[PDB]
Design a protein around this ligand. Sequence first.
Ligand SMILES: [Zn+2]
Lengths: 545, 372, 353
Amino acid sequence: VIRTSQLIPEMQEAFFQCQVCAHTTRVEMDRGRIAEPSVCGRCHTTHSMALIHNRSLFSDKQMIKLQESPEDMPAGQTPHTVILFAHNDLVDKVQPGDRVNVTGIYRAVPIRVNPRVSNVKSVYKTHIDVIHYRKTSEKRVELLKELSRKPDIYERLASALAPSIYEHEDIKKGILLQLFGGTRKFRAEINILLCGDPGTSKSQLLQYVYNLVPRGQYTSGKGSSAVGLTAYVMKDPETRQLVLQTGALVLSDNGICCIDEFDKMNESTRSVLHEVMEQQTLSIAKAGIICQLNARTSVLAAANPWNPKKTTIENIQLPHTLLSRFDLIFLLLDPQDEAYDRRLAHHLVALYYQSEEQAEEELLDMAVLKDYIAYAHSTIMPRLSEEASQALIEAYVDMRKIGSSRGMVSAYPRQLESLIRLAEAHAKVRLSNKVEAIDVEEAKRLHREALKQSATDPRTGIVDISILTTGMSATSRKRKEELAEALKKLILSKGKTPALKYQQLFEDIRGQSDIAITKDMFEEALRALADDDFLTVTGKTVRLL
Amino acid sequence: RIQETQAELPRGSIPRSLEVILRAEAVESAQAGDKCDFTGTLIVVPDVSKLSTPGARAETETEGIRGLRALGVRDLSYRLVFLACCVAPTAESIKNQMTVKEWEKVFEMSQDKNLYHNLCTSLFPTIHGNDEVKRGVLLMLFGGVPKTTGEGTSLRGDINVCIVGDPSTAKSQFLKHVEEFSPRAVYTSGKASSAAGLTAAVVRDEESHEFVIEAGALMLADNGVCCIDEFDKMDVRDQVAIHEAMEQQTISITKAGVKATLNARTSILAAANPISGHYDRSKSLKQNINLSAPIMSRFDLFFILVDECNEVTDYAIARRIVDLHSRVYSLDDIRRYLLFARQFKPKISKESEDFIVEQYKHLRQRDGSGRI
Amino acid sequence: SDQVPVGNIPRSITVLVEGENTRIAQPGDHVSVTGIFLPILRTGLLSETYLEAHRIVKMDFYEKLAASIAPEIYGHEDVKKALLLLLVGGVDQSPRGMKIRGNINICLMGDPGVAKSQLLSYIDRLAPRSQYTTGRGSSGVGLTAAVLRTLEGGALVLADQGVCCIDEFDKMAEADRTAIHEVMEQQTISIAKAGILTTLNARCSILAAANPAYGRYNPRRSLEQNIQLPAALLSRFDLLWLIQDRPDRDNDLRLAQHITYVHQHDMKLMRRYIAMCREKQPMVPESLADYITAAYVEMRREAWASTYTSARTLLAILRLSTALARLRMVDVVEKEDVNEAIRLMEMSKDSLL
DNA sequence: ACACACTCTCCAATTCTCTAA
DNA sequence: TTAGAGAATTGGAGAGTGTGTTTTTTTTTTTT
Ligand SMILES: [Zn+2]
């Protein structure tokens, strides 16, 4: 199927009323022709009978357009098409893009040369008159209850995800927790980010989880993508009237939205994404249309730059304003392990011989997992316990204490929200109406592991929170400050002169430094000293204030 | 023209739309973007271009009906329309709305003791400490009386407030909280989510390749309150336009095909980050922040928020958060009282002039002794 | 076109087919037509005409076949074998939707003015179903299909059960790159006739020719720095070969003698061989899978010790070894096929240095 | 060349009147 | 009492007349 028309009304029985004396009569009609009365039989006055449109009797019709499917084509040719008409009961049963088998009567009709003239052409037009077309529980609850009461159900449900991926268990657990989510002020849903080299299996993983949830959506940050992240207004190709096209983020409200090549989206896209993830709504003001939309959606993103000398945010393009919103962040790269390659190749060989003897079992577990998630989502609301409250408070205190040795901040309320959401999701996986220490200890484990992998400074082997809140290691900050002080001292040592040449200062600094200072570093130091009201840069000359 | 609301659209489907007809007293009661319920009847409308009459002629993959005298040898086709008989959303006004209960409540508030602190507590119950900020932001809601000088120039009414602080702490809470409380308010940022940004912009309309305007945040926030986040990082184009918008409360455009003066009558509450994230407690605000002196001189009040890792304070904040998750005046009382209070237009007394001029003189000579 | 007089635009004529003469003719096909020439009936004294049709008339083995490819060109022995296996192809494995495709795809990186044009045009001439295009986006129709006032054309479309060749690939645009990416993934395309989302077959294999951004290739820099396509799609190709060449007295004299001699003064068997041998779809036994596992992990150990190796490498080895097994009249892959594929993929790196 | 709108004419149907069956 | 012929008025069957009828170069704003 390619396109479907709006619904068309169609006449069945005309209603005629006399203008002179209000007498009425009905006319059953003949293959499209109406037998209009010439005279009112009651009052014998000619040309006095009028057709009353809204008193007549009508029926429904629709026009559908269909194309031959790509498999049965001759090589290299373009496809053929036909027009179908469907009446009464069948009038709205298909939508564009899907595929059908149809039975009908093959009709043929003449066409007129012009709307005024009554001559007809000698070559007829044909269409299909549709008659039929075909498209190509307590037991479950008790099974789910028994399965949920089985030990290590959290590991089992996580293991069920993406059988093509053999080792990334804690990532699967994080994705499972995102699918379960918290419950309803504060944003209850979870956002996850995947980072590392291109060509890794992350896009396949997005496409896998996309296919597991009813309200799911999938698109790319590239401009070539099939549907945009931004809402817009356009003219209908049929009527040429305006229609409002909401973006993928709006459509995935109360659902999961998978985004690919996230790293190379443009600034306007980043801005609207920031708005959506902070406010959970989207604002529009264009062409006379002014409104606010609900856009409470769960984001799952895959990103790219590997370079171990620098942390994730230091390698990839995007700002800390966005990266600081994900509840957890994961990194994917090769381990350079012989046993890992051997196991991966062995799993690949097993997949080469993949067979119904286990494909059916994985399919059954997938169906049961869909039922498990749907049931849990439909009824379960985890609520706080004294043990969980104590453990969560202690976790926040641990993170504040971790910064105390450096005399600095290392926790703030958003971190505690991530722990709470993860603990609620873990409680819901157990089908528990109470969130409890079992959930919090696992939430601490996942959060600590995520901090270790995402926010370690590779220059020291220690988690540096300023990486996640400013985009750089504190090492970079110290180096920039030291460079600015060295530059200031160099200018002061030549302070008898009001203007110094840019290239001369670059050569002075680079001749006195151990680091091979770049043009960007030198200019950032100059800009810092200009913001400090110490100097003004006028082209190739640096001048004192 | 109407369209299926977001709640009804079945997954993967394109939206359907319908033509609605309004008559007599119901006319111009709905604007584009509104969501409403319509009551009436579905009707069938013919193609009027192919009928003929003694008064007027006919103008001229489907076929219509045939065989009426008025239709000649042409054929006639119909379309669906919805005729709506009714449509509804899906000073004296105060006297009409306030019952004796509301009158008694605003009277009790007028007679209340330490009402200032009571309203601070009632409007900002979640906040900890920082009373000066609460008093300052509360006063902004009451504004100030605008005045027109006899020669036609006018004097500014609204106050503007600025809050600078560390990304870890309270400044974001105030913005989102007052936005949730207040009527007719806008939240945005210096890194705006549209081509217009904070002030009006020009765009070419492809229906004629003709230049037209598009509204920015400060136009939509006219007669309201505007909340701007990450104000330290902003486009230069908007930054120049803000110079006029802050004091003259208007925006002026003069480009190809467009010449206009636009209103921007607004109270602004801005939030900003100091350089290096944490505020340097040893240095002035002017050394800490990114803003230039002309913009900075516009605001009537400034405040600074910066953290330190005191164990008891951290433990108290954590317990407050987890307790909130575990669970004097209502917001509607504040709304009703505020709308009552804003009808007063108090004068300055003759004796107050002496104190005002004295205090300004004292401030000026202090500034001259060690700009205002 | 060759019948048009100098400095003129070619003309066209309408032909009406009726009765038992229908469905003979095809687009793009040479024909000779017998008919009656008549004027069209109105509903001025000047009138259009057409031709009323009465009749329409249309106008070992491995080393031997390897040596038969491009004999005009000296050397490049294993490159010719790579192109042979490109024409033969591997097998679509199709295990219950966990698809591995059999089509080989390769890319040639050439120094300025090097002999690759002769080899490329030889494969273009040789192949029984193929097409050619150039990346500059010329005034004609593009890589994908296009619309006129019905849909038509496109190099990716017109080569379907065959191989398509792209020239000066490095000058492609983002539209071209996304089109190639979509063909590599789904082997189908989309073009909108009138806003409708029509879609169209593109089942063919791809052969790419590219040139460095400036001058000769530099061995001191990576191929990404030299050719400057993005690594994501550039690494799709099963094999990459740098066609580098330089002056020498005897070889230049031999070439000059050949060119001046040319200026002064069985494909049917090959096609039948590839027709009969490509009927095979050879499997692998578990012993060969274990052997490939050991070989692959050892190869990746050396690759990181000496990185580029990935799952794509393993599937390339499978494709070329199965393709060689198809070149033999044998129902299964064997050790020698894996070894041949391994030395071919291994030695290809030597062309870059 | 092929359709509406308008104007106009002549032929013979319907009733009055006188007459025969 | 029932029915047919000769004269007068009127309806409408029919004819005649008048008229209508994708594909290229250049500017402007804002995005890069
Ligand atoms: Zn009547």
